[PDB]
Design a protein around this ligand. Structure first.
Ligand code: TRP
Ligand code: TRP
Lengths: 307, 300
């Protein structure tokens, strides 16, 4: 591989909290940053590793585009990257800074560059998944509320499950521990073929389950993969039914179970759906995952398995 | 300019808070972003993305001046990196920036046309980011360091290219005089001088330490052969990082950021005593009060 030790980190951090995050969230970052508080530095570390994960994923994706010369991709990299890597090194992620330098070093094949890009992205995606689990979203929870009536009102202001072929549905089970909850889901292999491929290849796995903090009632967890598969079928998130399983290679590789009303209007690649029989089981897990992500940080693990 | 409707807003928003910024700060975004009836998380996201979005727009703009990178190869990179950022920014209370992102991506009939849209747009986004930094509720972070643990170039160049200028903070009433080193980063200094005079909101660093900065009205890709580690900077140092958006940075004490920063000039030693008093009111402005403070920079 291009960076085998990186892969060792990517493996460890599936089950385990990366040290960076632990020193970040307890204001123990050696450089003691943040103009006698650290929240602002912490906020920065979180948001910027998130956006760097996106950046990198689009560089990874660009790398599949042979109209852009490998050298042009590397040039683009050396330009856009340092402002992110150097700052992240300063603010809690110094290993990432050195590895970012490594990814840029003069490479000799597209495949090699691309292998670095996919590797690095996976690493940063996991740093981002942990960073997301631990950020104090509860802060504006007594300070800044949407008022109930306006909310129900905008809910009042406003098929892709019928496309393709039922014969090609591939079954799987989602298991949420320690809740001991379980549903059986179907994956539309026919809709986004290499997408669902990339997702079933990874199976099984056990990752951490967290909650959306913008779009509404939408759980997502960061799967151990990077897919650049076509996404011909995408569905707007506000139009998603309850129980929809959407992937989002754009934003890491999040297995996004949607269980309740969401407001986001950006389109999302369709993976599958929970079997109607088990959709009602979702509200509970969704509330407990809101609790963990918003509040308690009590980890809730996902296991996805090929039935 | 390739986008005049954009130029007019670039002007207005130096003086007036962008409706978007306020709408998000008050959580009035029609799409009610934020899970479970609160908009702090959405507020954070919008601010965070719009800030790093500008960073990406700037590095793109620098790539647009790079003649090895093809204009079409650039269009391709743009059309790849831009959507995941701009379309969410369109969902989180910035529909206009999302409409303009697409216009920026349309096929450029020249490299200058494309460099131009990127300049006007980078600046528009840098101004939205300026106000968002000003209004984000940093005081909400409760997350304080331990007291014990917190406890725990001007010579170089030519004295005839020291261009005098005056920085006046309002309502601070403090008007320090200063010299810009027109000879250390000529291209950058020239860029800075052609914007004088301006009057933009003065805001404080939130991660760096005792340093202030204000989004100037310019987009410079000018080389910066003379830089100094932020940590090693004298009180009264003027620096200018266009990488994170052009900001006139005034350092008024010790900092801990170890990145290097373009050397723009210095406040004269005499007036440096006045910087401390204006650092505090600015910190309390950004962190707590949000009460505006306006920096005017003009040439004497
Ligand atoms: N809709 C997402 C916002 C988002 C966009 N890109 C992301 C990447 C990682 C995490 C969250 C996001 C949310 O509610 O959280
Ligand atoms: N050092 C900066 C952090 C930063 C990086 N990029 C930025 C862009 C805009 C504002 C701030 C930043 C600070 O203390 O704030």
């Amino acid at each position: 591989s291009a960076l085998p030790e990186l892969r060792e980190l990517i493996a460890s951090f599936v089950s385990e909290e990366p040290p960076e995050i632990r020193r970040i969230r307890t204001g123990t970052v050696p450089d003691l940053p943040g103009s006698g508080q650290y929240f602002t530095a912490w906020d920065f570390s979180n948001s910027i590793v998130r956006d760097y994960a996106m950046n990198l994923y689009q560089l990874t994706r660009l790398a599949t585009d042979e109209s852009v010369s490998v050298e042009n991709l590397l040039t683009v990299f050396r330009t856009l990257d340092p402002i992110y890597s150097t700052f992240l090194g300063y603010n809690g992620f110094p290993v990432l800074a050195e590895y970012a330098q490594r990814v840029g070093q003069p490479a000799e094949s597209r495949a090699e560059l691309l292998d670095r890009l996919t590797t690095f992205t996976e690493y940063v995606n996991r740093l981002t998944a942990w960073s997301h689990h631990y950020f104090p979203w509860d802060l504006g929870g007594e300070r800044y509320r949407y008022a109930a009536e306006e909310v129900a009102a905008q809910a009042a202001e406003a098929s892709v499950d019928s496309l393709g072929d039922p014969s090609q549905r591939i079954p799987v089970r989602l298991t949420w521990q320690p809740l001991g909850v379980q549903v059986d889901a179907e994956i539309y292999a026919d809709l986004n073929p290499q997408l669902a491929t990339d997702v079933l290849k990874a199976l099984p796995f056990t990752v951490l389950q967290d909650h959306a903090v913008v779009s509404g009632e939408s759980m997502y967890a960061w799967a151990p993969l990077v897919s650049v598969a076509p996404t011909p079928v995408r569905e707007r998130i506000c139009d998603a039914p309850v129980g929809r399983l959407r992937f989002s290679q754009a934003t890491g590789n999040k297995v996004i179970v949607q269980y309740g009303p969401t407001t986001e209007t950006l389109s999302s690649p369709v993976l599958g759906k929970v079997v109607d029989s088990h959709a009602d089981r979702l509200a509970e897990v969704g509330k407990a995952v809101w609790e963990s992500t918003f509040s308690s940080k009590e980890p809730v693990w996902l296991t996805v398995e090929r039935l």
